[PDB]
Amino acid sequence: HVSRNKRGQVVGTRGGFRGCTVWLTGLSGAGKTTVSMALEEYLVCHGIPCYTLDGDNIRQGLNKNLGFSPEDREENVRRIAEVAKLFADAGLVCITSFISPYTQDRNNARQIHEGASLPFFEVFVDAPLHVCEQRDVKGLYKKARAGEIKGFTGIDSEYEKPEAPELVLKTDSCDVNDCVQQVVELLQERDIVPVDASYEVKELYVPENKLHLAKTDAETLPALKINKVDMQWVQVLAEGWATPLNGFMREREYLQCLHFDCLLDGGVINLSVPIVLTATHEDKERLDGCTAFALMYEGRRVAILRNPEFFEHRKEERCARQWGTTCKNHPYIKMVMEQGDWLIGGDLQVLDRVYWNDGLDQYRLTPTELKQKFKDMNADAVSAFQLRNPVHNGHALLMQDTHKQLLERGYRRPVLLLHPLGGWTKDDDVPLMWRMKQHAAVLEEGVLNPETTVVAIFPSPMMYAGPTEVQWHCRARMVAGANFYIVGRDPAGMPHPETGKDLYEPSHGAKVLTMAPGLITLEIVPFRVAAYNKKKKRMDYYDSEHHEDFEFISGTRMRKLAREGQKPPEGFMAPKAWTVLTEYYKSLEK
Amino acid sequence: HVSRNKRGQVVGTRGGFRGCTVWLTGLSGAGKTTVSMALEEYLVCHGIPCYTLDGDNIRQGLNKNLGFSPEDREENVRRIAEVAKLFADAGLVCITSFISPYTQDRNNARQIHEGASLPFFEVFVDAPLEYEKPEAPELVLKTDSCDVNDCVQQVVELLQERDIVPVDASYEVKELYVPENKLHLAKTDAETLPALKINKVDMQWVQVLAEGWATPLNGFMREREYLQCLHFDCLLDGGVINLSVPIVLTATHEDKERLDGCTAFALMYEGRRVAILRNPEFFEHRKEERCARQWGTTCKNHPYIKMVMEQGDWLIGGDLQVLDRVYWNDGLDQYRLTPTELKQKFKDMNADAVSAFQLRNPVHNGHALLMQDTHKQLLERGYRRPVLLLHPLGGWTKDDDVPLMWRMKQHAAVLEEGVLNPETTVVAIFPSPMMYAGPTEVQWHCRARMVAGANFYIVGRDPAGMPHPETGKDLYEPSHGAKVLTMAPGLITLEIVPFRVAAYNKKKKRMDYYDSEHHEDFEFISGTRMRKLAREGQKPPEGFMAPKAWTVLTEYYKSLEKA
Ligand SMILES: Nc1ncnc2c1ncn2[C@@H]1O[C@H](COP(=O)(O)OP(=O)(O)O)[C@@H](O)[C@H]1O
Numbered sequence A: 001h002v003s004r005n006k007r008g009q010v011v012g013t014r015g016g017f018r019g020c021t022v023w024l025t026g027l028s029g030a031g032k033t034t035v036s037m038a039l040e041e042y043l044v045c046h047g048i049p050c051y052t053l054d055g056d057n058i059r060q061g062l063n064k065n066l067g068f069s070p071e072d073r074e075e076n077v078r079r080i081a082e083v084a085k086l087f088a089d090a091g092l093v094c095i096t097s098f099i100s101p102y103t104q105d106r107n108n109a110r111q112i113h114e115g116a117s118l119p120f121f122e123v124f125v126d127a128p129l130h131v132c133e134q135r136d137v138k139g140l141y142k143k144a145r146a147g148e149i150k151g152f153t154g155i156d157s158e159y160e161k162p163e164a165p166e167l168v169l170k171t172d173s174c175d176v177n178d179c180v181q182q183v184v185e186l187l188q189e190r191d192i193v194p195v196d197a198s199y200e201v202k203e204l205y206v207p208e209n210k211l212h213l214a215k216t217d218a219e220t221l222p223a224l225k226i227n228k229v230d231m232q233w234v235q236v237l238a239e240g241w242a243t244p245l246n247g248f249m250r251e252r253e254y255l256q257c258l259h260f261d262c263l264l265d266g267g268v269i270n271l272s273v274p275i276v277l278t279a280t281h282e283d284k285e286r287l288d289g290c291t292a293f294a295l296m297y298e299g300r301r302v303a304i305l306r307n308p309e310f311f312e313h314r315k316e317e318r319c320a321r322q323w324g325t326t327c328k329n330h331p332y333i334k335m336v337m338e339q340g341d342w343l344i345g346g347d348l349q350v351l352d353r354v355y356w357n358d359g360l361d362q363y364r365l366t367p368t369e370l371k372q373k374f375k376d377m378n379a380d381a382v383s384a385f386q387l388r389n390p391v392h393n394g395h396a397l398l399m400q401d402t403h404k405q406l407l408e409r410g411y412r413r414p415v416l417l418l419h420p421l422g423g424w425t426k427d428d429d430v431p432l433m434w435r436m437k438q439h440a441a442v443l444e445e446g447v448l449n450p451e452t453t454v455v456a457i458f459p460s461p462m463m464y465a466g467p468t469e470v471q472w473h474c475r476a477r478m479v480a481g482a483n484f485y486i487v488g489r490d491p492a493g494m495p496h497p498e499t500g501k502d503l504y505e506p507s508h509g510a511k512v513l514t515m516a517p518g519l520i521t522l523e524i525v526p527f528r529v530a531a532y533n534k535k536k537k538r539m540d541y542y543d544s545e546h547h548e549d550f551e552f553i554s555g556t557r558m559r560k561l562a563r564e565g566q567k568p569p570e571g572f573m574a575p576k577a578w579t580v581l582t583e584y585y586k587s588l589e590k
Numbered sequence B: 001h002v003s004r005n006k007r008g009q010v011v012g013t014r015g016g017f018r019g020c021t022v023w024l025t026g027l028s029g030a031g032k033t034t035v036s037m038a039l040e041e042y043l044v045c046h047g048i049p050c051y052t053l054d055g056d057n058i059r060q061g062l063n064k065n066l067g068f069s070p071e072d073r074e075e076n077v078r079r080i081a082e083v084a085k086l087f088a089d090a091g092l093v094c095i096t097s098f099i100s101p102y103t104q105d106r107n108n109a110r111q112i113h114e115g116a117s118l119p120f121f122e123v124f125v126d127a128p129l130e131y132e133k134p135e136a137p138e139l140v141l142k143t144d145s146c147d148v149n150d151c152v153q154q155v156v157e158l159l160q161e162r163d164i165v166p167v168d169a170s171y172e173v174k175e176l177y178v179p180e181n182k183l184h185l186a187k188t189d190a191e192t193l194p195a196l197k198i199n200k201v202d203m204q205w206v207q208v209l210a211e212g213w214a215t216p217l218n219g220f221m222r223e224r225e226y227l228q229c230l231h232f233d234c235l236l237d238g239g240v241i242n243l244s245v246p247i248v249l250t251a252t253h254e255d256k257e258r259l260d261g262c263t264a265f266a267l268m269y270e271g272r273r274v275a276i277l278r279n280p281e282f283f284e285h286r287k288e289e290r291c292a293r294q295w296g297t298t299c300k301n302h303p304y305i306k307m308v309m310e311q312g313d314w315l316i317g318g319d320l321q322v323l324d325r326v327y328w329n330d331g332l333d334q335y336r337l338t339p340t341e342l343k344q345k346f347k348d349m350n351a352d353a354v355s356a357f358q359l360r361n362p363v364h365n366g367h368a369l370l371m372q373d374t375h376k377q378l379l380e381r382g383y384r385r386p387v388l389l390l391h392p393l394g395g396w397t398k399d400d401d402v403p404l405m406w407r408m409k410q411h412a413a414v415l416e417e418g419v420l421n422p423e424t425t426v427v428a429i430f431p432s433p434m435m436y437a438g439p440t441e442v443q444w445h446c447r448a449r450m451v452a453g454a455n456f457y458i459v460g461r462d463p464a465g466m467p468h469p470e471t472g473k474d475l476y477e478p479s480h481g482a483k484v485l486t487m488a489p490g491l492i493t494l495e496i497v498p499f500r501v502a503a504y505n506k507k508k509k510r511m512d513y514y515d516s517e518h519h520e521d522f523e524f525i526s527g528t529r530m531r532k533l534a535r536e537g538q539k540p541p542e543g544f545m546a547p548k549a550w551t552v553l554t555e556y557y558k559s560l561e562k563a
């Protein structure tokens, strides 16, 4: 015969043998039918073939010749157990749904399974006899109280409670979802049902109560000195923004990311940018072989990377695939080109909590802290606005028009996550402190409402990789609990350093995002280019037949106006936000 | 309870509900046992969950309390039939192997099935020597007089007829040829249309498309498809399927402007109208980005990138209706099988597994080793008639590669020498241009073969690579092709069979897998070294290449030298 290992490559789409028997037992009306039906449905919605033995298929086929007097009752269970073991042998999750009141009959069913190395999960669907009588789902209790059913178990027979059930379901204190979840978690604990890849936040910080230990432990390890952009990726990871990574990407994750823009093990997860740690040939030969090493920023041990692996940093290829150009003078590519030729993946345990002592640590909320913030505000929708530039009223418009659309849909407490990036940025961008003072100003003028707006800083470095990057911007906000992701023209783009043309076609980030896999809990809210409209004296959506009506105001014109001592047109930006920028531009010329 | 249709979607890996019972009956123990065991292996080898009820799992279990009384035996057969019913209900092919001598009982078993709307196939294993021969069995297996595999084939054919086993569950090929009954009208209509001249590489991609290798594209990629392809290596709309290379048509600004607005236009190659492209859309090429994402470099001297860089700034997608059957009239057309002709070929040869070997170079015995070991692997896993699709690429190749005609002559010599077995090998030309994009292109090599019905796809070292024209180092990391392919999405109906690098073992005098400890037992002979050796009138070591095949290459290199 074909082995269990091989029958399981072909039973279902999920690999690996998982035949077993989930043996429900309890009083008439305790919940067995209802649990097995909901379990079966879960299993089938998750790709795991199963089959249920119950009163409707056993009693009138195989067991039709069995009456009620007690040797028949014993034989009934025995036959059910033998059939179930056969189903389990065949690679199915067999669910059985019979009162099965006697301990001896159920231990026998367990032993027929265990003697054949098939898992047997005895699930006691436990509700008091009075409750099951109350329910009297099929009117059998009312018919027993007045004769003409037998030793109806609970009344004229006994029900013998299992002594060591794999699970007890207290159906008078829990709901059907509680039941199904408790059973599914059992089956996951026991490797019958796999744990799919998830976006549920996963911090890589060691628990506070394990901290001091981990620090001591970190002291005994060899060490690798990291730089500030790295430390900032250490924070992206620590806080969960790259959930479910367990650390810097291993080879297999890096290659998935570069070719498919997704992690694929255990389900499709969007992750389009490498999150890697680099190393020179010298650091590799030093650390290669150790099972753990510490990462050291500004002479402090900030994280431990366990079970590391070293693989090549094929830099030209990485760059080409991530940015769609290998141009040496792209400012993030320039840094990648100066890194080592090795990458290191492993499981990252981050130690002290990351704080930059710079005056802005109050805005650097983790995804958990943000989710908590959204619930504390009782939002029923969260829209996110990634950005790296001062907010002008073209951005504000996209935020204002999304807030509108969510009102018109029915939401009654939309919250805006105004989410500037604070990780590394290229030289000629507006420094983070400036931009935050600038958005504070925009909020003080009420262009965005401070009572419905959370302002926090996204710790990722900025890569300037367009349609590749904007998936990362988007997914990061989905992790933090955004339900809606606002995207306009050329997101994450910049001019090509050699040609001066746009590196990326401006509609690409949005088109790509609207069809990118793994972006399941959010909706993409895309917008056309907005620009100062000179006729209507406000920011508006650009229109082609009407070219003369619109002023495009670049970071470069603004810097010019600020020197000349002038102002952009009224309604381009909030006057106090402008003032912040004049103060910015003043220090810049020095 | 979840319905049959829904249980049918999760039970196995092929989709469609196919619960039924194959009820063997007859005296011969070995006949029943050999048939059930082999049918079981076949079903599992082909992705169909099944389960056998026989003495070894019923007698001492479910029926352990039944003996030989006429009543016990009847009950014995009743219980097995009800259980079989439950497996068939669960979506499995249930095979039961019991003498079941009595018409009454077999007939009852059938009614338990037929009354629950489950197919029941009574198979009389008839091997003459109060058994009651079935009056109208679905099948008669003469097991004493036909071998096991023909018997199993008989059952499998019956299951195909009755829609349990798929006649064919490769990905359905979508040709883009206009059907032979509409061609004349379609060529007349093409005559009325504007025209866009295309070159020969284009006309090869027209062929890729026509013949269905890029299923489910309906023609040259529209923007959406191009973006999915470059970012995700897959088409996504209505299902994820692997497609990692752009399949596109380029155009100049001048041709875009002439043609933008037209709802259809003809493609013209050597003065002939070869295709119509309908409802075209024009979008920006973006050559540097395309090149970077597709090849992992923008190096201007990579020989396909160099062609992409001389094409126009526009791409044109649309619905492609290919007219005349593409034929090249160079003497190799007999090998240019479409995916539909290949599937039919594999049927005619009664394959029960197809292993594909993509290549673009002369076959040496390292390549052969991969094929031979694959063939071993398939036999060991239960396949009885594995067929090798030897599938040289025949579209554009770079300047110093061995020309296609010489390669086909070389491979005919390899098969003439028995290094691969001509009787279990189909030799056909894959019509794609070769891009030399390594791990990106290897997915395209693999998906193309999937559409042609390959069940297993062999991949080795540095598939689809080449030296970086600047450094001469490998453009791609040499393990990446395999690693990426083994995990690539959208290639669900075949299996990847990856191999480590093979090389000439001096000690053993044969091609073998390389070993780091043993570095110096291994000679690596490149195409370069082959050419040098020919020029000085030497041969490679014995066992590296079939002799007749080497001789073809000397003829090739000789014709170079005349040049
Ligand atoms: N958490 C629970 N799990 C299962 N059933 C529950 C639960 N809470 C209430 N019930 C109800 O209890 C009754 C159980 O009936 P049923 O499943 O047929 O019991 P059994 O099959 O054990 O005779 C149903 O009406 C069901 O909705």
Ligand SMILES: Nc1ncnc2c1ncn2[C@@H]1O[C@H](COP(=O)(O)OP(=O)(O)O)[C@@H](O)[C@H]1O
Residues within 6 Å of the ligand: A386, A387, A388, A389, A394, A395, A398, A486, A487, A488, A489, A490, A491, A492, A493, A527, A528, A529, A530, A531
């Ligand atoms: N003026 C514009 N009109 C429409 N959308 C815009 C405009 N300017 C910026 N956007 C969009 O607003 C956000 C702009 O943020 P911006 O700070 O430059 O940084 P980035 O796009 O790098 O994240 C993105 O969604 C981007 O597409």
Ligand SMILES: Nc1ncnc2c1ncn2[C@@H]1O[C@H](COP(=O)(O)OP(=O)(O)O)[C@@H](O)[C@H]1O
Residues within 6 Å of the ligand: B358, B359, B360, B361, B362, B366, B367, B370, B458, B459, B460, B461, B462, B463, B464, B465, B499, B500, B501, B502, B503
């Ligand atoms: N010496 C070798 N050892 C192992 N695999 C090899 C070897 N040479 C080539 N291969 C593999 O053999 C197949 C054919 O190689 P080749 O004809 O050179 O073309 P390409 O790899 O472009 O398809 C590919 O799977 C390739 O990885």
